[PDB]
Each structure stands twice: as structure tokens, then as C-alpha cells.
């Protein structure tokens, strides 16, 4: 579609429709794109004496990009509530992406006055890779996503990537990608950009919590037919001789009953308390953290495998890194106090998954004999064993929607750690750039490259439409469920609403597990 | 089908047919159903000061249920022998369930005399859920299954389930199910009940044992072309200097040969001996046992992952919890001596799986250097690694047939731990109840609920027909196999036979692995 | 019964009827240890919000 | 328990008034059900405003 | 309808017609729209001790 200068290239669509099998969410925002790096690529690398773990080598590019990968882009807090309360599962099906009403502005800064004028003949160039030939940045939980609240205007983030490094020095295998080298549609004012995308078949996300736990999956009324060792020694009344005896497990001792399944795997965490008095006084943020080790550099495992955050009535404590932590509106980047952050809580997974701060179990250390006593050891890390079941981490409201499974010889249970849908072919990246306009070349010829350009930026609207598939809840539970409810009491401000200054805010993380299924 | 009072609603079918691809087993039993809990639901919970691990919260129901889930229901000891000796694998295909010849009896207890009379107009109500909307009790190895020997009459067990708890107190997510709330067929005398079921596609159970082991899978005659470090230091004759040398592995040293596969995973067990003298004299039944930890409560892992019970010529020893233990006929529930129980033995898995009582292997602890000696550590627990192979636990004769895979985001190798077939949609539960008959209401109206009912019970026959698929054994082995044989010597009683009092008994566990396949 | 569905543009969440999350001896709308069913509170049908 | 049926009519004090009506329920056609008979009917509600 | 920059998108209609069963009134005005609240929502409430 190519219109004139005065025709509008596309309408505003921000909507949600519910067909009861499907929900189709649409959102439209206004974006503003500057020129990054003065129209030129650069390499960037870890600064000077940065620690061995912090070294990196990569390139920054003039290009920007769009990321809708956060849920709250697509769902309003009320739309999120219909889904969360009424449904067992959901997955995306197909999406559509449309850019329109582009306009490019040249700015002239003279003295203190800056005049911003339309540049009608300038262009903006956009491409979507869709063959996945670029480093895929999305899914790293970077900022720059479409704003939660539709009236916001957002700046388009700059695109950059990292490659192999030794220290800050590059390695011969490190790749350099020139984004100018791909076919891209060039858009002048009165052109629009579109593409549609179809998600590959993916398991539903589970929005339900279990009403039973692995430990307690059996009829309390009836005894098992399987014996266990109830006791190992019998008294002679002067001394206790060694005689081993057996019992059928039943309501009296539940812990001894033969069970047919095992909890999910654990990689242990350190426990810290929200009350500042209970925590130790030392710097253990790093030396005490749980880490993994590649190529001689440690990396904190922030998300971790999916685990319950705390046991019964422990709500005070939370794992050191083991949870997602969101900031409240207007929170600074660094060294911000506990009251500012919003800490998510996974306790709905207690049933099938171990508590992140405690060990999987205990294991016999040695072979007993008449002269030596039996001994056991604690298993702080457990890989997958046959017959283990587990729940995936919850997606919440502002968490990421998807991630790209790396392309590798093998991978186990592709579901991402931060939550969301593992996608082998995720939604492609959309990269956008202001085409350079030179400024007043010299009359004599010079073979050097231009250092002078017209200063300009562009703006327009972006529209994303995703189609979601729903899994309805059919259950015979007699008594009421738990629902997500906005509190009835009065308040100065309404939750999920602008304040007197016009600042939209999200009071708490909303995770998707309320409705209950039996295990 | 609805017949009169005098017509018979169905014939007795107890049979086994073999078509050589398929075997179809049929069994018919007589059941007797009482009225449980005086026709009313109750909640049940752990008693008083019961230990943290033993707390539970749940409900007991008036309903009974049928479970055929044990093999010996379907197979006779001779039918089990045709299958075990002649076949590599078997799985179930489709089954059929039929209830008939129901009759309801009212009992009147006056003085010491109790007269039992037919109540012709009373009903019995039965439903199968088949949408899996109830807590699934089956597969927990509870008693109350159809008897092994067809002449036995059995009581139908009561139905109850557990839910979330904190201590003995309930949690808001705990679900209450009213069984009166489902559609159910009501059966008077002269009605019958039927349904059929088709098993989802499932891997055959392996009834074969390997004739090779992972350690020894190569031609002893020919050397490998791959070197290993044969030695690390060479003598100068005053001292031994450090010089590292290599060798091709061959018949001389088998242990050093490069191998392409690894044994299955281990979670270590404590070893106890059947001879009462060798065991230590202390109470280690619990403190020494191997356990897992959920939500602050430990649970003994009785079945464990599938492992060999003992190494060569260790037959005395067995893992603490690591085996299935069956009681001999007429064994008491609690604190019963070693002579009464029948302990199963997994040693046929030695080839591909580690011994349950010993460690997976050893692992280097530290980085060696000229001034420090190399050190190693023992790995007592090993999760799955790429290139691991293992065998599943054996089903035996009286073990359970199947289990229900919990419905969860992910699960690894669904095969159950107790043995048998993991079924995502297992055979549904069949629940049965005596419909309440009030007794002589008062002439004046009262809005209170009835506390008075006619005392009655019901009885009838139940018939289960399963169709099994067989995997035939085609092998070039020259020398004879091992078969399951009843001993030729004389005895007072015949095995698997009633005694002089009429008490049927099973002398030993019969596991399904005899025929041998090469690995 | 015939139902009238709720179509509304309200941005922020509604009020819903929720069984409390805290632990308790007995579950609401459930039989007790004696088998006596009970209803803890009246549940009236007005929660969702329409503008006047 | 099924409740008993009774009704009230005009009165002056506890005394009846000439307009008070007496209904004999034996006087209507009724299906007689022995063991093995069932009773059915269906009903259609007249058009009524939704409850809000 | 989408015209250029120089085409007029619609004519002025201000009229009244009477068909004697019906009267059809038409009116056309010129409007001017500013930007309110600096492009952002706000909450407003009764002032202080009202």
C-alpha cells in the first residue's frame, strides 16, 4: 500500500475479542526512532580491567528493532483476568504485524533554538529476517518493549550483539554481520509495512495449580499390600539385638508408603529473608551465590530451574537468585532497596517441585556392617531421573512471552527458564533504520566517506495482533476456586491506573496460576 | 439390558484364549458391598501429634470402587507361564467391563438374631468417570483388588482421597469432590452395567534379560585403534620420573577399552543382609534410609529407580527400600519377621543398570600439579546423561499392571517406578454405592436430614476381560534357555494351590524376565 | 438458564468472588468431620461492574 | 422429607367468612404410580427480564 | 474517501428542508481542537476540605 502525502496509511487498532475458543489481542503504539552511532557500526568490548567474568566483545549497529515479547503489551489487566481466572491453558497461534503513518522529521539546531520540520522525501528502511540469520536478541528480557499502557510513546532500542572473545580480544571465529547487507523495504511517508507469522505447534502453558501433591496421592483408608522395613532391631531387655521387621504402610505412617513418582530436579539456592534482621551480615551476594562455569568464567544462574520458593508458612524467605524480581514504577537501575522491587513467589509449585532453598533428599553414604553404623549424605543437586515430574515456571503478567531454543545437537525439555514458550522458530526480528541523508558535499571530489549528515528522526505507529488458543476448565470441584480479585477497600489510587500526575503503574506481579486441577 | 426378577442378567465368563498374536484373559468374581460411613461424607486428617511427615488431610466417601490393577487377577499361574517363557514382550490393547446379577439384601438385627431378606425394589448406582475428573486412587498398590483365586468372594473397598494440607489444617486450594454430583446409572435387580476401554499405544514391557552387559560389548580378539594412558611415570632407576605413555586397549586390559555407552542412573540405597548376624545393631530404618524432600516433609523412596539389587554372589544382601516386598499368605500388617515376607530380586538387570547399594563410579576431585597428588571422589547419585541406557523394573505376578502419569508440564520417561505401564489415560475408575433407603419418617414435618436408614448391602458378579498383545521371541541362540519350572520333587502341598483348609497361597514372586536377548 | 455475557472496556481488574487463600481447619462449603454440610456466608450475585 | 401441603383463606378473627374456599386435592386428575412407574413433565418459562 | 493534499474532502452543507411530513435540518460548523493534559491521562478529585 502506497498512499499520498495526505492520505492516512493505516487505522488505529487496539482491541481484544473473545470467541471462546480463541482470544485475539490487538495493540497499537506510537514509536520514535533516532539515529544511533552517527549512522555507523562500531565494535564494543569490556572496559579495561573488568573482571574475567565480565569480558565481552561485540558490535553496536545503527539499526533499531521492535520487541513486543512482554505479555502486558498484548493484555490489559482486565483482559489478563478473564484468561487467568477462566482457563487452564493458553498458547499463541498466529500473529500479524503492521507499520503505518510513518513520518520523518529533520531537526536544525542553531543557537539555542531548534526547529523541527517535515522532511517529505526522506525514507525509512525496515526488514524482518525470518530466516534467523542474525544473532537473536529477543528473549533476553531487555527493556524497550512496547509500553504497558497504550497512551505511552516509546523510543525504539538500538540493536547490538556479542560474539566470541578471549579477554576483550576477538577470536577468529567471531562473526561480523552487516545489516545493510539484507533486502529491506524502504518506506517513505505514505508507505506501510506488514507481515504475518504463524507459531509452530507448542504445548499449552499450564495456568492451573494442583490440588494434590506427589507425596500424598493415595487412598488413606486402605492399606498397601507392599511391606517396608518398619524397624531394624528388637530388644532382649538387657540389650537390643539386631532383628529386622516389616510392615504394610497405611494411614498411620504415610511417609513409608511406596510411591510411584519422584519430584522434579533441583539445583540448590541460598535462602535470604525479606526482614533485614534475619540475614547474615557479610557480602555473600557473589561468593555465596549459586553459579555455573563455562570456559573459565562463572555466571550467576539467576532464573534457575523451576522450584518452589519456600515451604509452608515461610513466606518471609525467598531464594537468593531463584526468583524473578520486577521493579515498581519509577525504580532506579542500581542498588535499590527491597521496598522498591516486586519479588515474585512460586509457592504454587510446592506439590510437584522441591523447595529451591533445601536439598532434594538424603542418600546412603556407606555400606553398613555389624561393626560400623550406617551413614547418609545430603543431595544438594539432582539431575533428571526416570519417573520424575515437574512444573514449569510461571509466566506472570510482565514476564516474557517466548524464547528461541538454541540450534544445537541436543536439548532437554526446551521450555525456557524465565518462563514462556520455547520456540524453535520464534517471531522474527523487525529491524528499522533512518536512511542517511548527506549534507552539502564539497564541490571538489573527495574519495573519503561522509562525516556530515542531516540530523533527523522518524516516528509512526506500530500494530501487533496475536491470536491465542485457550484450554477451557472442566472440573467437578464442589467448593469455590481462588480468583484474582482487586481489593474492595478504599484507596487513594486505583491499582493498574494512572495517578494524579499521569504515571501508569503496576502494583504487583500477576502470575497465571489460580484455577486448580487435581494431580 | 433389563431383565425381570427371575431372569439371569449375565453368564459367568472366566477364560483364557490364545490366538498366538493375542491372548484374551477373562475373569469373573463375586463381590459384596456394604454401606460406608453411614451414607455420608467425612473429612479425615492426621491424628493429633503425628509427625510432620505424616500429616494428611482428605475426605472419606460412602462410595466403593473396583480395582483389577494387579496381574494375578487376570492370569493364572499357568497362563502366566505361557507368557513368561515364550514371549519377549506384551502390552494391553483393549478391555471390557461388565456387572451383572446384582441383588440387594436388607438385614434386620433384633436381639441376637439377624435375618437377611431380599429387598427387590432397592437400587445400586454405578458410574465410571472416564473424563478423569476425580482423584485417581488406583496404582498406589492398595489392597482390595480382585482375589487371585476365582472361588474367592471379596469386599469392595471404600473410596477416599487426600488434598493439600498445612499440618492437619486444610489450605484454600484443597478441593472437595461430591460423588453424588456425577451422572450415574442406577441398577435394580435385573439390570447390568457395561463399558469397554481401549488402551492408548504404549511400549511393550520387556520380559527378556540381556546376554551381554554394557561393560563387555566388544570383540575380544581384535585390538582397538584408540589409545589410552596406560601409565603416567617411568623409572630412572634411582627415582621414577614423570613420563606419560599410551596403549591400545585389548583383551589383556578390557577395563580400559573405549566404550560407547553408559549405565543407567543411580540413587544410592543402604544395604541390609537377610542373615540377622551381619546387620548392624541400631535403629537405622529411618535415619539411615534414603529419602526425598518436599515442602518440608521427608518421604522414604521405597520403590526407587530401577537398579540391580546385588552384584555377583551377593544374593544374601538386598537394598534397604530398593525392592518390592510381598507378604506370604496370612501375614500380619505390622512388625512381621523376615520369614513371612517374600522379597523380590532384580539381579537380572545387572547388565545395564548399577547395583542399588553401590556408587555409580568415581570422579576426579581436583586439578593435579607437580606438587599435589591427584584425588577422586565417589558419585553416590547420578542423574541422566547423554548416552545412558537402562532397563525398567520388572512387573512380576502380583505387582500392579499400570499407573497414571500425573498431568504436568513435563515428565521424563513416564514408565512408573513400581513397574507396569505408564498410562496418560488409564482405565477409568468404577465407583459403586448402595442407594440410601430411609426408615419410617416422622408423621410431622422436620427439615432436618435423615439419621435413620434401612441397613442393607448388595452383591453380584463382576467380569473383566483384557486383550493383550504379544511380542514373539525369534532368536538364534543354540543352547537352551532358562524357563520357569515348578520343582519336580515331592511335597506336602502343591505350589499355587489350596491347602487342606482351603486357603490359596502363592509361594514365591514370579517375575517376567527369563528369555534372553543379546544386548 | 440463559446467560448475558459481559463485554466491557474497563482497563483495570474487576472484583471477583474468591475463597480465601489462608489455611483453615475446615474448608468452606464442605462437610466437616461429622459429615455436616455448611454454607459459611451468603453469596450474592453482584460483582462485575457496568457503568451506569 | 417432603413437606406437608396447607393453605389459608379469608377469616374474621379465627372464624371463616362465606367467601373462604375449600379445595379437595382428591378432586383433580392424578397419575397413580406403582413401583416401576415414573412421572415426568416439562415446563417453559415465559419471557422475563434478565436478573442484573 | 481519501483525497490529496489539495482536494477538498467535503462541501459545506447548512440547510433546512421541509417535506411536510418531515423536516431535515443540516448544520455545519468550524471546530478547533487543542491538545489536552499534555497528551496524558490524569485523575482528578475534590479539592482538599470540600
UniProtKB/Swiss-Prot annotation, chains A, B:
Disulfide bonds: none annotated. The keyword Translocase does not apply. It is found in: Virion; Host nucleus, Host nucleolus. The N-terminus of VP1 is sequestered within the mature capsid. It contains a phospholipase A2-like region and putative nuclear localization signals. GO terms for cellular component: host cell nucleolus; T=1 icosahedral viral capsid. Belongs to the parvoviridae capsid protein family. Its main location: virion. Capsid protein self-assembles to form an icosahedral capsid with a T=1 symmetry, about 22 nm in diameter, and consisting of 60 copies of three size variants of the capsid protein VP1, VP2 and VP3 which differ in their N-terminus. The capsid encapsulates the genomic ssDNA. Binds to host cell heparan sulfate and uses host ITGA5-ITGB1 as coreceptor on the cell surface to provide virion attachment to target cell. This attachment induces virion internalization predominantly through clathrin-dependent endocytosis. This is Capsid protein VP1. It comes from Adeno-associated virus 2 (isolate Srivastava/1982). GO terms for biological process: clathrin-dependent endocytosis of virus by host cell; symbiont entry into host cell via permeabilization of host membrane; virion attachment to host cell. Keywords: Capsid protein, Clathrin-mediated endocytosis of virus by host, Host nucleus, Host-virus interaction, T=1 icosahedral capsid protein, Viral attachment to host cell, Viral penetration into host cytoplasm, Viral penetration via permeabilization of host membrane, Virion, Virus endocytosis by host, Virus entry into host cell. The gene is VP1. The ratio at which VP1, VP2 and VP3 proteins are synthesized in vivo is about 1:1:10, which is the same as in the mature virus particle. One of its GO terms (molecular function) is structural molecule activity. It comes from the Viruses. AAV capsids serve as viral gene transfer vectors that have been shown to affect long-term gene expression and disease correction with low toxicity in animal models, and are well tolerated in human clinical trials.
